[PDB]
Design a protein around this ligand. Structure first.
Ligand SMILES: CCCCCCCCCCCCCC(=O)O
Lengths: 238, 251, 16, 228, 223, 249, 17, 17, 15, 17
């Protein structure tokens, strides 16, 4: 009769406990293993994969592939904004449903850099230049290309390359930021501007489209696992 | 330029064009370690592992997309299909080459993806789609730009923005894929390995893969530019194995 | 680590 | 600038992602009838959250930790002085093909072979681990095929799901007062292996046996591309 | 000399303390309880922690759950044993809107299932802060416009804690009271500050009603 | 000595002590404790120099004065400019309180540097206003009498509680000195960066608060000079700025 | 003579020795 | 690791291996 | 066989 | 047995040897 004293927490079922349990099927000969391609070991392996971003969330475009199309056109203006969304990968609609955002919504905290790949799907004869800028928080969303000029930005020439990667760095007061919207964990604003108007020849379409892809860089991690708010249930599906 | 040669066939695929090798795996033959079928397989080699060019389809300014089930796409193509009928179990990789060429004055972008186990949903939530609706032998079945109604008991909910799988169409990039941007692209080449939970499976009852070609940026072109842009799919079995010889099948 | 049960399925998760 | 913040990605491993207990199904049984026993066919698609987490992958392989939370409640009664003694319950697993209880007092409850747990109320929830019990080299989450070679009959993951039935009963005898109980099944994948990731579910689930969905929008909407 | 062991911060703070307690009933569909996790609703622990500006520690959570029979008109109540579920919802997760919500599946959200009559349930939790130390005070705002919120409630975002009966009690109504207990383990403190003098007024800010510096005597020679 | 930082030299030359914060001399952020990935700006001579705020008068009734520090140098030169243009900043300070009287004067000031001086309100249901908590170079004043509750969104400036609900006589835990006119003419405190994060925004968060509270009041006989001013001179030290963008307001 | 049974450091006893 | 606590062999677990 | 108690009367039977 | 589970000496058993 070994003397023992039960401590608080006994006869307790903690969802996230990691104890050993007696097997109900002793000596069960499991089927051997097979080398199935594409083994995943971490959900960051998924979050690091580029996925198309629905930048054009317009009510009418959201239920169509028009959601993913960023319109650009040959203009008479000089520095017209192309698009602008906040850097809320897990909260704002522009990114919350991306691959990255879908993974983020299972965790509470996030930290790291972000790849924004922009692919120009216009005619081979079209050219132009764009200013892709990430403005950290504290100020307002840049209202002019001049305002955006003062933050981390990139001049993307369409003529030479069709794809261009803006790598948004992790510039934050804290080591992590909340996946959910909190001003404290502000993120910034990502804008695009016309650096040089899209010049097209005769008999070529002057209005083209751009696709945006989001992924995580090698320095991205998540924390405080939770349930996603995207899935809902009223009764057991049958 | 480079030459991809499989048996009697040879493709010309740019020179810098990236061949996307599935999940990093090059198709290979089954190993004695992972097998259970005791009968010696048939490896047709040159007769089966070759480039079958399926039907071409027309890309028009409103096209929503196309898809093929793979085992049921090469079912009527040559000795691959013959062995497919005569054997109970099969195992295959693929080399998929989707070709589309326009001119400098054209524009557009296709997503070419390989979805393993592309189980699709129905229009009537109380039924599963019919065999003909899911399957089109070398006859691409088309995605739709609109929801199909509850009416039509046995059809596939072909709304493109859900890919008929209840997901965000913009997330299909997790599956091995390429983009054909007419600005800078002429073709897409994907080498898919054998993807399945079991070492071998029947080739009529189970479509292990599903090719999807979805235009994300629609075709457009000025007046005068050629208005008929076809897309031609050419698939080649790779390291094909068959076990369980028997009578053919009426399938 | 010390395992009390004869079947590997009874062991704790592989977190380390 | 140079930075040396090595934030470990430990909690995003598949093992941690899936290794948390989740309610997959719960059913009821009462002390009133002779067929009051409860039964459940074992699937992972009746529950939304766990299913979605698993559906993020095409092929999975893992052991399972089963924890049962059995809760009882006094039901209305007409006689006087319901002095209910301690209640004991039996959870029986009937593998596919075994005899099936047709009544609360069937011979099947002997469970000479069929595994089963006997648990008394008021103690720690019963728990039991079970190996990887699939016929294939991995559990299948999706199946682009049919059950019949004629490309007819059944289409989907319900041609692969055959995991047996789970029966529940009061071992205690009928008393002067009725008693209704609710068993809650909890799944916890241990020693997990995942393959071939796939896009997360966007449209709400509709049926347990198929992918059937009603199309939903790609994402939430804003008023413009510049709206911030 | 003697030893100052018991005056270390570890011994000072590493004692369980009731931080909050709420009640819920078995009847109705709102018969679940909820609490946004803050350390400023209770005075004793708040003062002890506020003796420092920045803290860092793990936590020992102990729950003291007690139920009681509420009035009933039935002729015989023999309620069976009661089981309780405590779910933690990190900020942004789904939130139970009813006793029978899908959120209670806790597929990912950790949660405790405890049956009455057993040892109180206990749970340790690591350092869950975004910064390199917990903040006890915040001389700033939430918005960069120097507006919106002023104080520690721009930082407190530790999620909510929900409570429910798992049992479907029918005959007799039953009201339960859960008491949350914090015990900081492995503590690290920085920048000590004056002990609180004026009584606490609000959980979300320093707002105080001025009181005198000390208790009074008559004259400087009074003794 | 002559603690000359940039284009600036103070002549404490008391040959007597400087209170160095919590025993830590301000230093730059290490690569081991940093999060922000972009390369910071370190203006050095242009920023780390002695900005002297507005002077105030010490009166026989004065209760005390306080400054929020980031929002005290917020409008002073290139420190303020970098502060506007960057999302993140990090600085220590050298704070020099100068007051000089004569042998025939008497009085004693407590000069403290309170990290995280979160202040209370007069109306318990509101938090004080930005203008009430902050004063740029216009030192905000402590009061001789309790502020009225009806005065919605004002600071409870009753000095015997220091506007923080504690005993003003216990502020000595924070780094401090005393200016006892009998034996002192200035106080020098070298404060390091005190915060829970490696960097923070300089407009949203006043990581420190300078407080000058007379514990023994000024007095003098008829004839002795009656106007005794106090001049505060603060110098950023090891200033860093990360996340360049457009400017704030 | 005290050992740690849990895989996470937060599970350990207080720093009393 | 398997240690037998009882003095009688009948008290031992099954010969599963 | 290890005995946990200081008194011989606490031991198990002499088997 | 030669053990003690608690960090404080007052927790130990009596000195009966
Ligand atoms: C008495 C113990 C009986 C327990 C038997 C339950 C076996 C079910 C295993 C679950 C398999 C999960 C398959 C999946 O959804 O991928």
């Amino acid at each position: 009769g070994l003397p023992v004293m039960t401590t608080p927490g006994s006869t307790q079922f903690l969802t996230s406990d990691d104890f050993q349990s007696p097997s109900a099927m002793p000596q069960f000969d499991v089927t051997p293993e097979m080398q199935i391609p594409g083994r995943v070991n971490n959900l960051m392996e998924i979050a690091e994969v580029d996925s198309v971003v629905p930048v054009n969330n317009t009510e009418a475009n959201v239920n169509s592939l028009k959601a993913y199309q960023i319109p650009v056109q040959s203009n008479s203006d000089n520095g017209k904004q192309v698009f602008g969304f906040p850097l809320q990968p897990g909260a704002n609609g522009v990114l919350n449903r991306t691959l990255l955002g879908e993974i983020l919504n299972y965790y509470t905290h996030w930290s790291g850099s972000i790849k924004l790949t922009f692919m120009f799907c216009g005619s081979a004869m079209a050219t132009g230049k764009f200013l892709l800028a990430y403005s950290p928080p504290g100020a307002g969303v840049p209202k002019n290309r001049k305002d955006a000029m003062l933050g981390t930005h990139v001049i993307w020439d369409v003529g030479l390359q069709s794809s261009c990667v803006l790598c948004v760095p992790w510039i934050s007061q804290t080591h992590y930021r909340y996946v959910v919207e909190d001003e404290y964990t502000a993120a910034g604003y990502i804008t695009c501007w016309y650096q040089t108007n899209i010049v097209v020849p005769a008999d070529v379409q002057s209005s083209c489209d751009i696709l945006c892809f989001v992924s995580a860089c090698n320095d991205f991690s998540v924390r405080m696992l939770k349930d996603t708010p995207f899935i809902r249930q009223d009764t057991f599906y049958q | 330029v480079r030459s991809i040669t499989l048996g009697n066939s040879t493709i010309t695929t740019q020179e810098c064009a990236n061949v996307v090798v599935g999940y990093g795996v090059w198709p290979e033959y089954l190993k004695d370690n992972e097998a259970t079928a005791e009968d010696q397989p048939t490896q047709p080699d040159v007769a089966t592992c070759r480039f079958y060019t399926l039907e071409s389809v027309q890309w028009m300014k409103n096209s929503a997309g196309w898809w093929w089930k793979l085992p049921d796409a090469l079912s009527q193509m040559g000795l691959f299909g013959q062995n497919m009928q005569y054997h109970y179990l099969g195992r295959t990789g693929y080399t998929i080459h989707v070709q589309c060429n326009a001119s400098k004055f054209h524009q557009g972008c296709l997503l070419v993806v390989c979805v393993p186990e592309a189980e699709m949903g129905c229009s009537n939530l109380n039924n599963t789609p019919e065999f003909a609706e899911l399957s089109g032998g070398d006859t691409a079945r088309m995605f739709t730009d609109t929801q199909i109604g509850e009416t039509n008991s046995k059809k596939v909910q072909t709304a493109v923005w859900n890919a008929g799988m209840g997901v965000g169409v913009g997330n299909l990039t997790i599956y091995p894929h390429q983009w054909i941007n007419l600005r800078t692209n002429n073709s897409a080449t994907i080498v898919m390995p054998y993807i399945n939970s079991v070492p071998m499976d029947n080739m009529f009852r189970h479509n292990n893969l599903t090719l999807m070609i979805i235009p994300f940026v629609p075709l457009n072109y000025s007046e005068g530019s050629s208005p008929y842009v076809p897309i031609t799919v050419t698939i080649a079995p790779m390291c094909a194995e068959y076990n369980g010889l028997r009578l053919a099948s009426s399938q | 680590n010390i395992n009390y049960y004869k079947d590997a399925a009874s062991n704790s998760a592989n977190r380390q | 600038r140079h930075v040396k913040n090595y934030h470990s990605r430990s909690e995003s491993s598949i093992e941690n992602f899936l290794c948390r207990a989740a309610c997959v199904y719960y059913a009821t049984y009462t002390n009133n009838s002779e067929k009051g026993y409860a039964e459940w066919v074992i699937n992972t698609r009746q529950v939304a959250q766990l299913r979605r987490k698993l559906e993020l992958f095409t092929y999975l392989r893992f052991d399972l930790e089963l924890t049962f939370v059995i809760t009882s409640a006094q039901q209305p009664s007409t006689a006087t002085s319901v002095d209910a003694p301690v209640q004991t319950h039996q959870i029986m697993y009937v593998p596919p093909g075994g005899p099936v209880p047709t009544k609360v007092t069937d011979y099947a409850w002997q469970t000479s072979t069929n595994p089963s747990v006997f648990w008394t109320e008021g103690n720690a929830p019963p728990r039991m681990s079970i190996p990887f019990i699939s016929i294939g080299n991995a559990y299948s989450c999706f199946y682009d095929g049919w059950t019949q070679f004629s490309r007819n009959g059944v289409y989907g993951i319900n041609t692969l799901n055959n995991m047996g039935t789970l029966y529940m009963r009061h071992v205690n005898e009928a008393g002067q007062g009725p008693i209704k109980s609710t068993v809650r099944i909890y799944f916890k994948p241990k020693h997990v292996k995942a393959w071939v990731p796939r896009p997360p579910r966007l449209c709400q689930y509709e049926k347990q046996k198929n992918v059937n969905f009603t199309p939903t929008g790609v994402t939430t909407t804003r008023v413009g591309i510049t709206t911030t």
